[PDB]
Amino acid sequence: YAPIFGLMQEKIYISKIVVEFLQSNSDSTYEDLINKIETTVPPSGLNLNRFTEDSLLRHAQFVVEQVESYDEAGDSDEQPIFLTPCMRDLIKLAGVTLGQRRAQARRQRGPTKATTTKLVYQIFDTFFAEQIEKKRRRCGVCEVCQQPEACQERRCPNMAMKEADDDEEVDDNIPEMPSPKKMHQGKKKKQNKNRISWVGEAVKTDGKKSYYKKVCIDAETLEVGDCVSVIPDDSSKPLYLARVTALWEDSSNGQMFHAHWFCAGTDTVLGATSDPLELFLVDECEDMQLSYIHSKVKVIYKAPSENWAMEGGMDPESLLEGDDGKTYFYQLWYDQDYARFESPPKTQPTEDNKFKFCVSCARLAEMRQKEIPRVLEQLEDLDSRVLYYSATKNGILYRVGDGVYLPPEAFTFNIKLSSPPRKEPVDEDLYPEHYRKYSLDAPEPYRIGRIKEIFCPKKSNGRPNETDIKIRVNKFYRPENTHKSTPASYHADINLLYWSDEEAVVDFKAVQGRCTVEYGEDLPECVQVYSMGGPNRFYFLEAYNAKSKSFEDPPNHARSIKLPKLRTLDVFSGCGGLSEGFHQAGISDTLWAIEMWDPAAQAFRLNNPGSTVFTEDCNILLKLVMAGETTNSRGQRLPQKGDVEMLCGGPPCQGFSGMNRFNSRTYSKFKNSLVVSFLSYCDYYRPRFFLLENVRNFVSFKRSMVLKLTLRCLVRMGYQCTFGVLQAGQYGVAQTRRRAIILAAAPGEKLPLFPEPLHVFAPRACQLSVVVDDKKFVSNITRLSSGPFRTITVRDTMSDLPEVRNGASALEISYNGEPQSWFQRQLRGAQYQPILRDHICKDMSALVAARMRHIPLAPGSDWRDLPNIEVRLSDGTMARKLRYTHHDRKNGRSSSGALRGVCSCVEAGKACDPAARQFNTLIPWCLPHTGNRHNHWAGLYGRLEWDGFFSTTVTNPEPMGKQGRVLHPEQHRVVSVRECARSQGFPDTYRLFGNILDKHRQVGNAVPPPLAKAIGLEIKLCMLAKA
Amino acid sequence: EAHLYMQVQIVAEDQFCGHQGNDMYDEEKVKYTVFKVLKNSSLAEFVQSLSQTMGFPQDQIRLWPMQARSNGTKRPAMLDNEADGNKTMIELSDNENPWTIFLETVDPELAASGATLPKFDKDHDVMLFLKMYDPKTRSLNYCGHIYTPISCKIRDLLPVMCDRAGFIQDTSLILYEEVKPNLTERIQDYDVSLDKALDELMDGDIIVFQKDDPENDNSELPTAKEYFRDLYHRVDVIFCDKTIPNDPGFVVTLSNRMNYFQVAKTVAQRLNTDPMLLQFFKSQGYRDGPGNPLRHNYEGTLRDLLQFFKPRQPKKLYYQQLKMKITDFENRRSFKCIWLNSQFREEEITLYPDKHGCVRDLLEECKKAVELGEKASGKLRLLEIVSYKIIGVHQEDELLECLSPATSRTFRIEEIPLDQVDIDKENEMLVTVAHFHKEVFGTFGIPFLLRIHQGEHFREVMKRIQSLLDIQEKEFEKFKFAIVMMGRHQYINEDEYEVNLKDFEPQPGNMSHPRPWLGLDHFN
C-alpha cells in the first residue's frame, strides 16, 4: 500500500503548492502554473523525482476540490480563487466536476491609492455619480445547486465559469451598425416670433439675390458670430445649438441665414462622461430660415493658457475662475468618423468673406475639391486621345515617370501564372484519432507599375473628356509572379522588382498611391541606404522576359531638416522594444523610464547605456516629484517639469480585465490602477506627444468605459486625441496580435495620423473597426486588405537558424550560415562575424519530448495525427498505449469497429467514471476525453507552418497551452527565445537578461519594434510639419 | 615656399592608343609630365614654357584642361588661350592639384610637310573622340580626335571615320555613344546634326563605331554595348584555402552577375577538382579571415558575397577542398559514439555520416575509422545503452533519423565476441551481469554477458569474470556475489559452488519482465 500512500502525499503536497501559489497572485496564466508546479522542489521524506504536468492532470480533482473548499469557508466580495484564468483553463482541459465534499480541514495587504493629481482626481470623482445606477440561470444539476439554503452556499461554479466566458467573449462583433449618419439631418420646428427687422444697410452687395446684412432683430440684437439655440421636431433629441455664420436677405426666398452647428459632448464618443456645458466644432453647416430661431445663448472659446506646459499639477479650483461652470464653451474640433479631436482649424477668411465665412463650408469645399481626380497639364494632342504631363488625386501629384500602385485586379501577366491528391485512409489501429481531422487567404500585394503616358479620350464633340483619365503602365513582375513562382521569393529582397515590356491600361481612379521605383546601378549610393531611406521605395535591377522566360538587362529607356531628438519618458517599458522602435525612427532619445520588474530593467540598461531606469513603482516617483525632490533614495536625478518631451507607454490591465459594465468594487480597483497614474504623469509633465498602448480588448473594456473615461480626462487636460487599433502583422512581423493605440498631441502641435499598412495580411485578423455605444469607429487607415510588400512568413523568420535540439542552453553559438531571407538580412546587420545569442528553447519533460518527436511534419499536423504506439522514454519509465473502454454516440465506432470513447461521460447525462482515466500515455487522455466540447482542441500540439504565422503573442510557449501552436516546423523542439524575438522583429544585436523563462516573457510582452517604428515615422512627420 | 607651387601633369595623345577600358586611358597606365609651378604664374607664361621646353611653336599646340563631369567621367574641357591666358592656374583649377591637361599638337611627321594646327571656333566647333571596336578581337583601337562643326551631319564624317580606321570606303558602320560606364546608346539616325544626335553635347564625348557585318554575330560580344557591359561587371577575386595558414591564394577574374554554380565550376576548373568537392566561405570583411560558411543552394550573386569590401580593398574568398560531395557534406550529422576495441576498452569517437542514411553506413564509416580484431569476425554492431543498461541492438537497415536524440543515449559499436555466437542451448546460458555498491539500486560499471554452464564449478565462473575484468588480484576478494530478481537479492556462497539454470531463468514462459541477473558488490 506504499504507492497509494505516496500518491496521497503527492496529492496533499500539490494541493498545498497550488493554494499557496494562488494566494501569491490571482492573475497567473496556465503556463505560470505549470512553471510553479515543475520548479517546486519535492520533499525529502517522500520518494519522488519531480512534479510534471501529468502529476497535476492526475491530481486535478483533489487540487480543485481543495481550492474550492478554501474559498467556500470564508466568502467575501473578492473574486473567488478558483476563477483565476489558469485554474479555469485546467478545469477546461480535465473533466473535473465542481462542488463536492469539501470542508475537510477539521477546524483548520491594502487597497492602496494612486497618486492622481487634482484635476484627474476631479474627473474621476465627477463621473463617480453615474456608476451606481443599476438568461444564464443556475444549472440545477450539480450538488451545490441541489443543496438547500442567492445563498452564498448555493453559488453555481458552472454558471460562474460561463459568466466568466461571457465577460471574456466580445459581445458582439457584428459588422454593422452602419456608419453614423449626418447630425441634425431631421427637420426643425418653426418658431412664431413677433417681429424680425434688419438694422442698417446691406453690408455686402454680391449683385445676386443675396444681400448680406449685419444685425437682425427678433426681440433681441443678433449679429454674425452669435450663438443660437434651436428646437427641432421632438424626436427624443435635445435642443440644437449653432452659430449664425452669415445673415443675408434673398430676393427669391424669405429671410435666410447659414448656421454652422456645434456638437454636444454627449453626442460624441464621450457620451455621458462629457461635461454637459462642453461643446465641440464639427463640419456640419446648413442654410435655414431665421424663423426657426429660438433664443440667444453665449459661448466662450476656452483657449489654452500661454503657459500650458507649466499648468500641470495646479489646483483646478484656483484656475476655475471665473463664471464657470455657468455657460457653454468649446475648445476642440471633433470628427466623429475617425473619432478625432483636433485644435480648431486656423483657416483665415478673406477680406471679401469677413461677414459670410463659414469654416464648415470652407472645409467641405476643400475636401470635395481634393477628392476629385483632376488632370493638370496638357502635353500633346491626337485625333482620338489627348495627352497630359501630370495629374493629381487626394492631395497627391503624379507625373509621367512615377511608380504607381494598382489594385491586384488591375491587370494580368502574360505568364500562365498558376498551373493546377488524396491519401488512403490510414490505419485506425496505428492512428486511432485521425478521424477528428475532418469528417479566406491573404491577397496578393499591390501591383506596381511605371507610367508611360497619361491621356484622356476625346468626346463626340471633340472636346477632351475630363470625367475619366486612362493611364498606360509598364508592369513590374515581382519575384513571386515570375515563372519561378513563390519559391523565387524566399530569398529575394522585399523591394525587389523586375522590369518588363508589357503595357496595361487602367482607369485613373484605380490608382491608389505613388511609390518611387528606381534603378539599382544609377543609384548614387548602395541600394541598402535607398531601401531604408524612406517609404514606398522599390528598386529594379534586371528585366524579365516572359515569352522566353529569361532574365535580360533592362532596355536603356527604362533608366532614370533634422529636428532635435525629443527627450522621452517610457512608462512601463519592459525590455524596451518601444524605445528601440523609436530609436529606429530616429525621433526620440529615452532619458528616463519606469519598470518594476528587475530583469526588464537590466535588459533596458544593457540595451540603452545612456538612460536612467528606476526600479520602483511609478506612484512613488510621482509623489516625490510632486513634493519637489530632485534625487531619489538611490540618488538618481528624477526629471522635473519641462524635461520630458514625448511620453509613451502601455500599462497592464489586470485589475479591470473584464468587459461587463462597471461595478463599485471594479471601479474602486480601477481608480488606483496604473492607467490613472499614467494620466497623472501626462497631466503634470505636459509632454509634446503622448502615446498609450494596450491589448485590443482595452477598447471595449467595461463597455468601452475605460476608453471613454481616459478620453474625457485627456480632453479636460486640453490635448488633442485619437484612438484606434492596429494589426502588427501588417508592419513586417510574422504574428497576428491586434493592439489598441491612443495618440495625443499637445496644443499647437499637429495630431499624428495612423501609419498606413505595409504588408498584406489575412483579412480574418484585419478587423480594425471598433464598436462604442452602438457606434462604429474606424481609424484613418485608407488601405484595406492591400499593400506594397508581401507577407512576412515564418520561413522568412527562422529558416537559417542553426539546428538545435530540445534542452539546448548554449547562450553563444555560431550562426553557421549566411542570412537567407530579407527579414533576416535586416535583422542581422551589415557586419558579418557575430556570435548569435540566446538561441535557447525550454527543456521539457521526456514524455512530452517523445510526444512531439512523433508528430508528423506535414503542414498543420497536430495531436490528431499522433500514433498509438508504445514508445520508450528518456527517464526509463513506460508509456502505455491508450485503451478505449467506452463507446460514444456522437462520433460512432471505427471502420474496424473498435471503441472510440474513453470515459463514461460520452453517454449523455453520465458522470465521469473514476479510475477510468489513463496517464503517462503517449497520446493524451484529456484530449480524446473532451475533444467534442472544444472543437476537438484543433491546433493543439501542432507545428507552425512554414508559410503561416505565429498564432498569437508568445510569453511562455507550451504544447497544450492557449497560445496556439508552439512547435518548430521541422526540428523536434518548441520555438526558442531567439526565435520568439525573431517573431516580434527584434534586431539580432538586441540584448536580453535573465534565465530562459524571463527572456521568453520579456520577448513576449514588448511591443514589436517594427510597429513602434511604424508609429515613430508618423509622429516625426508631424514634428517636421510644424517647423 | 613649397606651398605656392602645384604639380601640373601633362598627358600626350600617345597614351590614348591601346587603352581597353572606359574613357580615354587608365589613370594608372599613363606617363605624366609633371611641372612644379608658382600659383601666381599666368597661363600664357605656362603655355610659352611648355612650347619652348618640349620643342614646338606656341601656336602649334592647344591646351585641354582635364575636367570631371557630373556623371563621374573625366573629359577634356575648353580653355581659351587668348581670353583666359592671363589668369593664374590656381584660380582656374578652382582649388585643384595635381592638374592634368591634354596637350594637342600636330603630328611632327605631318607638320614637317607644312601642315599646321587647325583653327577652332569655341562656339561652333567641337572635339570628338573616335574609338574602333573590333568584335573579333574584342578590343578597342584609339582612332584619334577630330575638330568638327556642331551643325555638321554624321554622314559627312562617315567616310573620314572609315578611312581613319582603315576601312574600305562606303562601309556600313554601327555607331554608338559611350555616355558613361554601363550606358552605351546606339545612334539610330545618321542624317541628323551632332547637336541633335547627342544630348548635352560637350567636348571629350566618345563615339564608338564598328563594321556592320554579319560576321560580328559569331563574336561573343558582337557590339561595343555588351563589351562595355561585361567590362563594367568584371572583378578580380583572390581565392584562399583556409587550411593553409596565410595562404596568398590565386586570383580569378569573374563577373558580378554570377550565381554560386558558375563560381564553383570556375574555381573547380582552376583547381583541377570536382565542383562538389569544394566548400566556400564568405569573408569576415572588416578583419581578414574566414566567416560564415556558404550553403550549396545560395541564391545570391557575387556582389552580395563581396558587398562589404571597399572598392579599393582586395576582395578575398576562402575555401577548402572536400573528400565528399558538398550535398552529403552539408547533410552530415555529428554522431558522437563509443568504439569498443579488441581489448574491450572504450574510446570516444565522432563520425559525420549523411543524415539520410542507415546504420550500415555508420558502421562502414566506423570500420574505415578503426582497427578490427587480430583474426576476429571483422563484423561490427551497434548497441544502444541508457543508464549503463543495454536498451537495444540496432539492425543495420535502421534509419539514422529515428535514433534516440536524448543525451542519456549512448551508441556503442562492438565486435561480437567469439564465445557467445554458438553455445549449448540446454546447458549453457548467457546471463546479464552488472556492478553495484552496497544496495542494488546504485548500479555502475560496464555490464556484460557471461556464459554459465550446468552444475558448474563457481570458481571457474569467477576466473572467467577475472579474465574479463583483469585488475590487481586481491581486490577480487571483496566482491560480494548475489543473484538479483525483481529487486530481491540472495547472496551466493562462493566456495559452496551452488549453480544451476533454475536460479537464473524467470517463471515458465516469461520474457516480457526482467530476467534474473548476477550482481557484484564492491567499491569503485
From Swiss-Prot, chain A:
Residues 561-1027 are annotated as: Interaction with the PRC2/EED-EZH2 complex. The N-terminal part is required for homodimerization and acts as a regulatory domain. The CXXC-type zinc finger specifically binds to unmethylated CpG dinucleotides, positioning the autoinhibitory linker between the DNA and the active site, thus providing a mechanism to ensure that only hemimethylated CpG dinucleotides undergo methylation. It is found in: Nucleus. Changing Y1C: In HSN1E; unstable protein with decreased enzymatic activity and impaired heterochromatin binding ability after the S phase. Ubiquitous; highly expressed in fetal tissues, heart, kidney, placenta, peripheral blood mononuclear cells, and expressed at lower levels in spleen, lung, brain, small intestine, colon, liver, and skeletal muscle. Isoform 2 is less expressed than isoform 1. S-adenosyl-L-methionine binds at S573, G577, L578, E595, M596, D617, C618, N1005, V1007. The record marks S15 as: Important for activity. It is an enzyme of class 2 (transferase). Methylates CpG residues. Preferentially methylates hemimethylated DNA. Associates with DNA replication sites in S phase maintaining the methylation pattern in the newly synthesized strand, that is essential for epigenetic inheritance. Associates with chromatin during G2 and M phases to maintain DNA methylation independently of replication. It is responsible for maintaining methylation patterns established in development. DNA methylation is coordinated with methylation of histones. Mediates transcriptional repression by direct binding to HDAC2. Induction: Its abundance is reduced to non detectable levels at the G0 phase of the cell cycle and is dramatically induced upon entrance into the S-phase of the cell cycle. The lineage of its organism: Eukaryota, Metazoa, Chordata, Craniata, Vertebrata. The keyword Transcription regulation applies. The modification N6-acetyllysine is found at K214, K356, K423, K437, K509, K776, K842. Homodimer. Forms a stable complex with E2F1, BB1 and HDAC1. Forms a complex with DMAP1 and HDAC2, with direct interaction. Interacts with the PRC2/EED-EZH2 complex. Probably part of a corepressor complex containing ZNF304, TRIM28, SETDB1 and DNMT1. Interacts with UHRF1; promoting its recruitment to hemimethylated DNA. Interacts with USP7, promoting its deubiquitination. Interacts with PCNA. Interacts with MBD2 and MBD3. Interacts with DNMT3A and DNMT3B. Interacts with UBC9. Interacts with CSNK1D. Interacts with HDAC1. Interacts with BAZ2A/TIP5. Interacts with SIRT7. It comes from Homo sapiens (Human). The chain holds residues 495 to 1600 of 1616 of the full protein. GO terms for molecular function: DNA (cytosine-5-)-methyltransferase activity; DNA binding; DNA-methyltransferase activity; lncRNA binding; methyl-CpG binding; promoter-specific chromatin binding; zinc ion binding. This is DNA (cytosine-5)-methyltransferase 1. The modification Phosphoserine is found at S15, S55, S179, S197, S343.
Swiss-Prot record, chain B:
The modification N6-acetyllysine is found at K310. Isoform 1: Phosphorylated. Isoform 2: Not phosphorylated. Isoform 1: Polyneddylated. Isoform 2: Not Polyneddylated. Expressed in neural progenitor cells (at protein level). Widely expressed. Overexpressed in prostate cancer. Changing L198P: In HAFOUS; uncertain significance; the patient also carries a de novo clinically relevant variant in SLC2A1. It is found in: Nucleus; Cytoplasm; Nucleus, PML body; Chromosome. There is a cross-link at K310 (Glycyl lysine isopeptide (Lys-Gly) (interchain with G-Cter in ubiquitin)). The modification Phosphoserine is found at S404. Residues 63-242 are annotated as: Interaction with ICP0/VMW110. There is a cross-link at K310, K323 (Glycyl lysine isopeptide (Lys-Gly) (interchain with G-Cter in SUMO2)). Induction: Up-regulated in regulatory T-cells (Treg). Down-regulated during neural progenitor cell differentiation. It is linked to Hao-Fountain syndrome: An autosomal dominant neurodevelopmental disorder characterized by global developmental delay, varying degrees of intellectual disability, autism spectrum disorder, poor or absent speech, and mild facial dysmorphism. Most patients develop seizures. Additional variable features include hypotonia, hypogonadism in males, and ocular anomalies. Belongs to the peptidase C19 family. Monomer. Homodimer. Part of a complex with DAXX, MDM2, RASSF1 and USP7. Part of a complex with DAXX, MDM2 and USP7. Interacts with MDM2; the interaction is independent of p53/TP53. Interacts with DAXX; the interaction is direct and independent of MDM2 and p53/TP53. Component of a complex composed of KMT2E/MLL5 (isoform 3), OGT (isoform 1) and USP7; the complex stabilizes KMT2E/MLL5, preventing KMT2E/MLL5 ubiquitination and proteasomal-mediated degradation. Interacts (via MATH domain) with KMT2E/MLL5 isoform 3. Interacts with OGT isoform 1. The C-terminus plays a role in its oligomerization. Hydrolase that deubiquitinates target proteins such as ARMC5, FOXO4, DEPTOR, KAT5, p53/TP53, MDM2, ERCC6, DNMT1, UHRF1, PTEN, KMT2E/MLL5 and DAXX. Together with DAXX, prevents MDM2 self-ubiquitination and enhances the E3 ligase activity of MDM2 towards p53/TP53, thereby promoting p53/TP53 ubiquitination and proteasomal degradation. Deubiquitinates p53/TP53, preventing degradation of p53/TP53, and enhances p53/TP53-dependent transcription regulation, cell growth repression and apoptosis. (Microbial infection) Contributes to the overall stabilization and trans-activation capability of the herpesvirus 1 trans-acting transcriptional protein ICP0/VMW110 during HSV-1 infection. This is Ubiquitin carboxyl-terminal hydrolase 7. It comes from Homo sapiens. The lineage of its organism: Eukaryota, Metazoa, Chordata, Craniata, Vertebrata. The chain holds residues 560 to 1083 of 1102 of the full protein.
